[PDB]
Amino acid sequence: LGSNSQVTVAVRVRPFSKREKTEKASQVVFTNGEEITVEHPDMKQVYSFIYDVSFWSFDECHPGYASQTTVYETLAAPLLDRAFEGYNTCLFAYGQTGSGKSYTMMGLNEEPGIIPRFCEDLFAQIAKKQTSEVSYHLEMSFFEVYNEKIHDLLVCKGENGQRKQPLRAREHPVSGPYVEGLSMNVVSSYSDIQSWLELGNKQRATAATGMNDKSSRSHSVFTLVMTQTKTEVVEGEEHDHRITSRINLVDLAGSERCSTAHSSGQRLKEGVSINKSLLTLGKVISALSEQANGKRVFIPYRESTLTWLLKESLGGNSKTAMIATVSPAASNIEETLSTLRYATQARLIVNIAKVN
Amino acid sequence: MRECISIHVGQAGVQIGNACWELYCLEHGIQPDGQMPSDKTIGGGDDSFNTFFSETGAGKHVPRAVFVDLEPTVIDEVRTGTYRQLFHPEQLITGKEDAANNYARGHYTIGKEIIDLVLDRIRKLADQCTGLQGFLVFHSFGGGTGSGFTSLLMERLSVDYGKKSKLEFSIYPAPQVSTAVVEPYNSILTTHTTLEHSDCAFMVDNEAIYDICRRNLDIERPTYTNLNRLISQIVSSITASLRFDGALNVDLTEFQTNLVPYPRIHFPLATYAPVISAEKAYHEQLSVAEITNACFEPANQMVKCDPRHGKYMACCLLYRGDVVPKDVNAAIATIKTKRSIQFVDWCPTGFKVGINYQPPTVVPGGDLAKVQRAVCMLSNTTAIAEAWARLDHKFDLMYAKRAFVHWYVGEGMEEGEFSEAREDMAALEKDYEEVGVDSVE
Amino acid sequence: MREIVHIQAGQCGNQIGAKFWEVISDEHGIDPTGSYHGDSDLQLERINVYYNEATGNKYVPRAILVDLEPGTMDSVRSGPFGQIFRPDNFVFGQSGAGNNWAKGHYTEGAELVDSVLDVVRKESESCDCLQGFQLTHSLGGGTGSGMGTLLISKIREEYPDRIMNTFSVMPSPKVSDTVVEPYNATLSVHQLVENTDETYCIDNEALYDICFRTLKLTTPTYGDLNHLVSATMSGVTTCLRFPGQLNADLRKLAVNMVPFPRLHFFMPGFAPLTSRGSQQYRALTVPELTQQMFDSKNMMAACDPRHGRYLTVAAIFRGRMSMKEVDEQMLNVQNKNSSYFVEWIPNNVKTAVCDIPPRGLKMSATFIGNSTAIQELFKRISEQFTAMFRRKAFLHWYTGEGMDEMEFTEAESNMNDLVSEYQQYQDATADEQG
Ligand SMILES: CC(=O)O[C@H]1C(=O)[C@@]2(C)[C@H]([C@H](OC(=O)c3ccccc3)[C@]3(O)C[C@H](OC(=O)[C@H](O)[C@@H](NC(=O)c4ccccc4)c4ccccc4)C(C)=C1C3(C)C)[C@]1(OC(C)=O)CO[C@@H]1C[C@@H]2O
Ligand SMILES: Nc1nc2c(ncn2[C@@H]2O[C@H](COP(=O)(O)OP(=O)(O)OP(=O)(O)O)[C@@H](O)[C@H]2O)c(=O)[nH]1
Ligand SMILES: Nc1nc2c(ncn2[C@@H]2O[C@H](COP(=O)(O)OP(=O)(O)O)[C@@H](O)[C@H]2O)c(=O)[nH]1
Ligand SMILES: Nc1ncnc2c1ncn2[C@@H]1O[C@H](COP(=O)(O)OP(=O)(O)O)[C@@H](O)[C@H]1O
Ligand SMILES: [Mg+2]
Ligand SMILES: [Mg+2]
């Protein structure tokens, strides 16, 4: 208690896509450092936004190319030092459909994201100071929000026509919200967590739509728990005091307008739910921004499961970071601007982090 | 011959339509069974006017109309009414449930399943027409059907038909009166989607017509049946020259040309001056000067806005009956002499005139008197921007807190769609301002 | 094309239903043997909304009666309008819930809900296009709370794109009729806040005050309380059965009454009501009906709107009326009483008019209000709740049936969060510039 933090802000720009090269769209997003400027195609006006870090992955030729490992060592490594210091940690993305979110946190086989780097770097960090004075313990789960329902992705299943088992949320009067039945499996080596991860991502819900051939029909939260047992000077029982750190790495879905990417059936329902969830999230950020202005505000958490489980990961007791993602095409002006506005709001959120 | 198709979307549209088709059936001699009795003396002719009614060999006249509500009540009041044997049985209740005053239901969840059928029927109608000259869409900013379905339909028609005049008659949301908590949203989204497809949207308000029926007709307790009968006359004044003979005939394109300077300011207001009881039909001369000045009184406008807080960009005065052009020349001169009626510097010729020889018909059971002269004023003014501003402000007051949004997002919509719309309307307000700045070298 | 399923759980539910069907039949012209003996032809145009044809121009209700005590079902059968119901829709057991939410939700209701769901599926699949459901249930006891909420959850899971409405008799402030009301109410609220779309909160003390002041009745039985509630139930769904100048339905009301999803708890009311003698001294016009509607002493919710601000109100008028006077009167209510409304909603009043009034009235009106004063109910429960829960006063009868304390804390938290969401919108503060 007594801490006073800020919900940090990173902002990536992806390259031109296939559709964006089919239809020759021009450049509207520009980077000049940590300040990012977007102006309309019709030369109406110019908006510029201040942020904590920016990442211009547009072209490999530029100076200051912000590849995967730069994003990592700028966001996760600080968060990892905080997690080893005795804090809980959260890193959550936000953006448009196809804006480059799952490329960042998790990533592709030949260019991993923050998850396969965070887990490996903390394994190494443990390998340098796993004394017999201080011992370490690791477990994890990796769960999914799909159509208002929680799913566990690290679950081997048999062959069925009906096999997808939804879990429940509950509220512990001290610990806060949590999930009932979330298999937290022990992970003592990098091969183990890699096998878990590839068991998970292969279970995450996806489908082909207009803006992505492999789109995300769900939100994904990666729950990696680390306890560390330490000794202080007492002549009785030692290895006596525990310090815990829960890591929550969050990749969300898109906005999914039904005109830019027409859908019918299940592909339409998911979209609705996704959008609904995101809307509530916006309110939270806005409302919490108002809490920085000293105004009496009520934060809606309970309208969705995402904003309910991550209650403590926005206010509460954890150090949290946002990653906005945008596109350089002159089409995605309104979605880009809504993104950057929500990031400007999230910049202003404070959080009272607990030392464990 | 010349032919126009009417599309009566929504409760409001259907009620306006029932009134209008009552009026047209009376004007042309058609009975509710479709059977004209006096064609036995004509032997064909064209007095069974092809602008609105298609004729069979059996002597039955069928209106060129389409009726959509997305709920069964209103059209079932037609199928079981006095005009059940007039309309083709293809009046379209495919509405097992309605739009719940949600543009998202009206444009995506139930915007689809019904529009293919609507368009097929319009196609069947238009194939029966040689000289198709325009569409007339009756609807209401405020609901879902009359907002979203109208938006979608105009989108499809601007593809399938193209350069055909698509005029609209819309109920505008009033400042004080309102029958719903979510009319601002719907109105803004509709004006966003329609403003790139419509050619001229004739806007009315209900507070205005209530005040008219009170002050002039002396009805202290009016209802919609007493209101729409006025609106009908406006259409009968717009659609007169396509039916009857006159001295200065006005085809539909003449509106689209003269009242629409720039392609985004096509929102003119309607006005009908000789709204008099049969009592006050006596005691008054009802000359062209009186009616033409009444049309310019701010208290007799059918949209609650003051032209005195703005300027006139255009005005089309459509006359009916014993009217001589000299009277109109004198009247417009008297108006140009008056200083309270200010025009833009870039419109010295601001008046369009039309004279038909056929006076209006008196609907049996109505509140309006029999007249020898009638006038309809369609005026494009800068005042209505203020009205738009009001709506936009309301939008803000709720969009700040994201109220009533999960009903829209919940029925297939992104939240960004809101912001986009608002921006357009803001630009439109600016555009109105831009056309009020006087020109300087 | 717009069909409604009725479910009745418990004494309160079954007794209100017995009166509600008795009223809808009177409106539509159905006799106690299922036969149509009415005068107007509009009564049959939309009979499908509440009824089904069987064989011989006989009309059977689309109802489902639920209990865990036979005595409430026999009362229906041994009644005036009992022989019209489908006997295969009486789903009852024995050895009821015992004023225990647990027994109705987890133990006994778990052994009986499957039958109810079978009947629900049978009655829904026979629909061309179902609009929603309709549960009359008391909370303050067991079955109506537990079995009710369970059915609600399962229908919402099976039928999520429909409307789920509840007419609920909440506890009263002064006198209790069950000693374990707080727990059960808090848990039923924990279940309803997350699954319903619009619930109508009723309180017997308000209706006693109505029967005493307005109607001047000195010996009011429950058939009179339920007579008022049925009036309301009818009025909510009037613009689906009959025609009007400006129609509405449950979805349009919900869209125009629920700004945020959780605040779907409403105060009902109905006008005109008067003593049998005082009807010759009163003109029945829109002004008098509005004066009676927005009067604090005509609500059934036992919460003074003068202690809050209306978020959004709805008026479903029935009769031949002028829309000018409706809109004028509602505007006047908003302007003269500007402090009891919100600024961030410009017009808080939804309107609807049906042209076909009730059997003996020239005009009538139904009122649905969403106000912050509802907090004064839940807060009370929460106080009561903790006063018991701090001591574990009656818990072992709930834990013995397969519960835990986390459920209680969850329910209390949900209720208090809702109270705060209602509180944030009654402080009429001024912004910096506006
Ligand atoms: C002929 C006449 O003027 O007598 C009226 C009458 O005196 C009053 C008092 C009636 C009377 O109702 C009551 O006195 C009453 C008693 C206990 C609880 C509630 C009401 C009436 O009994 C009730 C009855 O109202 C109806 O019949 C409506 O259709 C009503 N349906 C039923 O009452 C009904 C119930 C069971 C079986 C058959 C019909 C209704 C209300 C809302 C929606 C649909 C239907 C009417 C006109 C009257 C009497 C008969 C005195 C009132 O009825 C209602 C709910 O509006 C009570 O206040 C109104 C005002 C009427 O003036
Ligand atoms: N002038 C006029 N306005 C009407 C009439 N009927 C309804 N309105 C207006 O229409 C608005 C309500 O929207 P509607 O046109 O009814 O919407 P809808 O077409 O019924 O679509 P849904 O909401 O899905 O039922 C109200 O604000 C009324 O002022 C009418 O007969 N005449
Ligand atoms: N308004 C009204 N409320 C009732 C009536 N009968 C019972 N109630 C309420 O409903 C509750 C009855 O609970 P109930 O479900 O029947 O208990 P159970 O028999 O064990 O299932 C009581 O607490 C009353 O407050 C009635 O006729 N009218
Ligand atoms: N900096 C980059 N360089 C090359 N490709 C990129 C870059 N950022 C994103 N992509 C590509 O964008 C595609 C989709 O991005 P992703 O965030 O996975 O979409 P979604 O958010 O729908 O999951 C991926 O196939 C990825 O290869
Ligand atoms: Mg993804
Ligand atoms: Mg309608």
| DSSP per residue, B201-224 | EEEE-HHHHHHHHHHTS--SS--H
Considering only CA atoms, which of B247, B332, B246 is closest in space to residue B288? B332
Chain centroid, CA A116 distance in Å: 14
Domains of chain A, CATH where assigned: 5-351 (3.40.850.10)
Rounded (5°) CA angle C16-C18-C21: 100
What is the C-alpha separation between A335 and C57, in angstroms, rounded?
A: 58
The catalytic site residues of B sit at 254
Task: Tell me if B96 and C2 make a contact (CB, 8 A cut-off).
Answer: yes
Do residues B10 and B146 both lie within one domain? yes
Amino acid at the residue B51: T
From the number of C-beta atoms within 10 Å of its C-beta (0-12, 13-18, 19+), residue C75 rates as middle
Q: Where are the beta strands (DSSP E) in C22-129?
A: 51-53, 59-61, 63-67, 90-92
| Phi and psi at residue C99, to the nearest 5° | 55, 30
**Domain C-terminal end among B245, B268, B291:** B268
B397:C1 CB<8 A = no
User: Based on the domain organization, do B377 and B393 belong to the same domain?
Assistant: no
Q: What is the DSSP string of B12-79?
A: HHHHHHHHHHHHHHHHHT--TTSB-STHHHHSS-S-S-TTTEEE-TTSBEEE-EEEE-SSHHHHHHHH
Contact between residue C162 and residue C387 where contact means Cβ atoms under 8 Å apart: no
Check: CB of residue B78 under 8 Å from CB of residue B18. yes
Q: How many residues does chain C have?
A: 434
Answer yes or no: do A338 and B415 touch at CB < 8 A: yes
Using DSSP bridges, classify how beta strands A135-146 and A219-230 pair: parallel, antiparallel or unpaired. antiparallel
Q: Please, which residues bridge with residue B54 across strands?
A: B62
Q: Which of residues 226-265 of C touch B (CB under 8 A)?
A: 239, 243-247, 249, 251-252, 254-256, 258-261
A96 annotated to a ligand binding site: yes
Going by alpha carbons, the residue nearest to atom 15 of ligand 1 is C224
Q: Do B406 and A338 touch (CB under 8 A)?
A: no
Among protein residues, the one whose CA lies closest to atom 57 of ligand 1: C273
Best to test chain C binding among A178, A291, A298 (most C CBs inside 10 Å) = A298
Of the candidates B183, B403, B9, B174, the residue with the CA atom closest to the CA atom of residue C350: B183
**Site from B414, B422, B430 to mutate, A interface, most A CB atoms within 10 angstroms:** B414
Neighbors of chain A with 3 or more C-beta pairs under 8 Å? B, C
**CA-to-CA distance for A215 and A254, rounded, in angstroms?**
9
Q: Give dist(CA B116, CA B120) in Å, integer.
A: 6
Q: DSSP letter at A45? A: -
| C424 contacts A303? CB cut-off 8 A | no
Q: Residue for token digits 């909510």? A: C236
Q: Determine the Cα–Cα distance for residues C64 and A286; give it in Å rounded to an integer.
A: 45
C427 contacts chain A (CB < 8 A): yes
Question: Are A209 and A215 contacting, i.e. CB atoms less than 8 angstroms apart?
Answer: yes
Which chains contact B through at least 3 pairs of Cβ atoms less than 8 Å apart? A, C
**Ligand with minimal distance to A209 CA:** 4
Q: Which of B171, B172, B177 to mutate to test the pocket of ligand 2 (most atoms within 8 A of CB)?
A: B171
Domain residues for the domain of B188 are 1-268
Work out whether strand C310-319 and strand C363-371 pair parallel, antiparallel, or are unpaired: antiparallel
Q: In what helix (H) or strand (E) does residue C362 lie, and over which residues does it extend? A: none
The whole-angstrom distance between A177's CA and the closest CA on chain C is: 10
**Closest C-alpha to A179, from A228, A242, A223:** A223
Give whole-number Cα distances, B11 to B57, B140, B149, C244, in Å: 33, 9, 13, 10
Burial group, residue C181, by CB count within 10 angstroms (0-12, 13-18, 19+): buried
The residues with which A91 forms a beta bridge, in sequence order, are A249, A321
The verdict on whether residue B421 carries a ligand-binding annotation is: no
Q: Examine the domain organization and report whether B375 and B421 are in the same domain.
A: no
Q: Output the CA A197–ligand 4 centroid distance in Å.
A: 19
Neighbouring-strand partners of residue B92: B68
- What is the rounded CA–CA span in Å between residue A40 and residue C377? 52
Convert C93-116 into a string of H (helix), E (strand) and C (coil). CCCCCCCCHHHHHHHCHHHCHHHH
For residue A350, which of A2, A50, A53 has the smallest C-alpha distance?
A: A2
Bridge partners (DSSP) of residue A227 are A137, A244
Residues in A 335-354 with any Cβ partner in B closer than 8 A:
335, 337-338
Q: Do the strands A53-56 and A8-13 form a parallel or antiparallel pair, or are they unpaired?
A: parallel
Q: Quickly tell me which residue has 């419509």 as its tokens.
A: B198
C-alpha separations of B297 from B217, B230, B292, B303, B367 in Å: 16, 17, 9, 12, 21
Cβ neighbours of A172 in C, within 8 Å:
406
DSSP C172: P
Q: What residues of chain A lie within 8 A of the CB of C260, using their CB?
A: 300, 303
Strand pairing report for A206-207 and A215-216: antiparallel
The experimental technique used to determine this model is cryo-EM
**What does the block give as tokens for B356?**
């038909």
Q: CB-based contacts of B52: which residues, under 8 Å, 6+ apart?
A: B4, B6, B24, B28, B63, B64, B239, B243
Cα A326 to middle of ligand 5, angstroms: 14
Closest in B108, B414, B420 to A275, CB measured: B414
Residues of chain B contacting residue C323, judged by C-beta atoms under 8 Å apart: 206, 222-224
Domain total for chain B?
Answer: 3
> How does strand C130-138 pair with strand C90-92?
unpaired
> Do residues B264 and B139 share a domain?
yes
- Measured from the Cβ of residue A177, the count of other Cβ atoms closer than 10 Å reads 20
In C246-275, the residues whose Cβ lies within 8 Å of chain A are 260-262
Give the angle C265-C267-C270 at the CA atoms, nearest 5°. 145
Q: Give the residue from B426, B427, B408 showing the smallest Cα distance to B417.
A: B408
Structure tokens at C52: 């089904």
Give chain A's length: 356
Does the CB of C362 have a partner CB in chain B at under 8 Å? Answer: no
Torsion, Cα of A332, A337, A339, A340 (10° steps): 130
Residue C102: which of C201, C183, C2, C209 has the closest Cα? Answer: C183
Helix (H, G, I), strand (E, B) or coil at B400: coil
Which chain C residue shows the shortest CA-CA distance from B75?
C243
Judge: A272–B409 Cβ closer than 8 Å, yes or no.
yes
Q: What's the token pair of residue A305?
A: 């499961």
Say yes or no: B160 and B279 in one domain: no
**Residue B237 and residue B252 in one domain:** yes
Residues with Cβ < 8 Å from C313, sequence gap 6 or more? Answer: C294, C348, C349, C350, C367, C368, C369, C370
A298 touches chain C (CB under 8 A): yes
* Rounded CA separation A215/A329 (Å): 19
B98 lines ligand 2 (CB under 6 A): yes
| Calculated CA dihedral for residues A330, A334, A335, A336, nearest 10 degrees | 60
B100–C249 CB contact, under 8 Å:
yes
Alpha-carbon distance values, C293 to A38, A119, C296, C305, C311 (Å)? 53, 64, 8, 12, 16
Q: Could you give the CA distance from residue C213 to residue C275 in angstroms, rounded to a whole number? A: 9
Nearest to A58 by CA among A23, A115, A20: A20
* Atom of ligand 4 lying closest to residue A253 CA: 21
Rounded alpha-carbon distances, angstroms, from residue A135 to B77, B107, B437, C41 = 80, 61, 77, 83
B219-to-A147, B227, B271 alpha-carbon distances in Å: 55, 11, 19
Active-site amino acid positions of A: 98, 100-103, 251, 254
Q: For residues C179 and C190, what is the distance between their CA atoms, to the nearest angstrom?
A: 19
**Short-list B295, B318, B133, CA closest to B237:** B318
**C-alpha to C-alpha distances, B72 to A230, B21, C1, nearest whole angstrom:** 73, 20, 8
Closest CA to C325 of B224, B27, B198: B224
Same domain, B253 and B339: no
> Which residue of chain C comes nearest to B77, CA vs CA?
C243
Angle between helices C10-28 and C222-236 (to 10 degrees): 60
Q: Report the C-alpha dihedral over residues A128, A129, A135, A136, rounded to 10 degrees.
A: -50
Nearest to C411 by CA among A302, A316, A166: A302
Is A270's Cβ below 8 Å from some Cβ in B? no
**Nearest Cβ partner of A303 from C262, C420, C423?**
C262
The burial of B280, by beta-carbon neighbours within 10 Å (0-12 exposed, 13-18 middle, 19 or more buried), is given as middle
The helix-helix angle for C113-125 and C143-158 (nearest 10°) equals 50
In the complex, which subunits touch C with 3 or more CB pairs below 8 angstroms? A, B
CA neighbor of C107 nearest in space, from C78, C136, C52, C150? C150
B188 and B140 together in one domain: yes
Residue with tokens 């349009």: C252
B33 shares its domain with B101: yes
The 10 Å Cβ neighbour count of residue C413 is 15
Q: Is A263 in the pocket of ligand 4 (CB under 6 A)?
A: no
Judgement on whether residues B249 and B284 belong to the same structural domain of the protein: no
